Structure 1
Amino acid sequence: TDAVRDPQTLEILDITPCSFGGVSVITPGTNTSNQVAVLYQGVNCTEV
Structure 2
Amino acid sequence: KFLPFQQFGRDIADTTDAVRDPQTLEILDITPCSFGGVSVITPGTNTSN
TM-score range for the pair, normalised by the shorter chain length: 0.5 to 0.7
Unaligned runs of 5+ in 2: 1-15
More RCO (CA 8 Å, sep 6+): 1
Aligned residues: 34
Unaligned runs of 5+ in 1: 35-48
Structure number with larger C-alpha Rg: 2
Verify the 8 A CA contact 1:6 1:13 in the aligned structure 2. Answer: no
Which of the numbers 30, 34, 40 marks the counterpart of 1:25? Answer: 40
Cα RMSD, aligned residues only: 1.3
Identity among equivalent positions (%) equals: 100
Higher helix share: 2
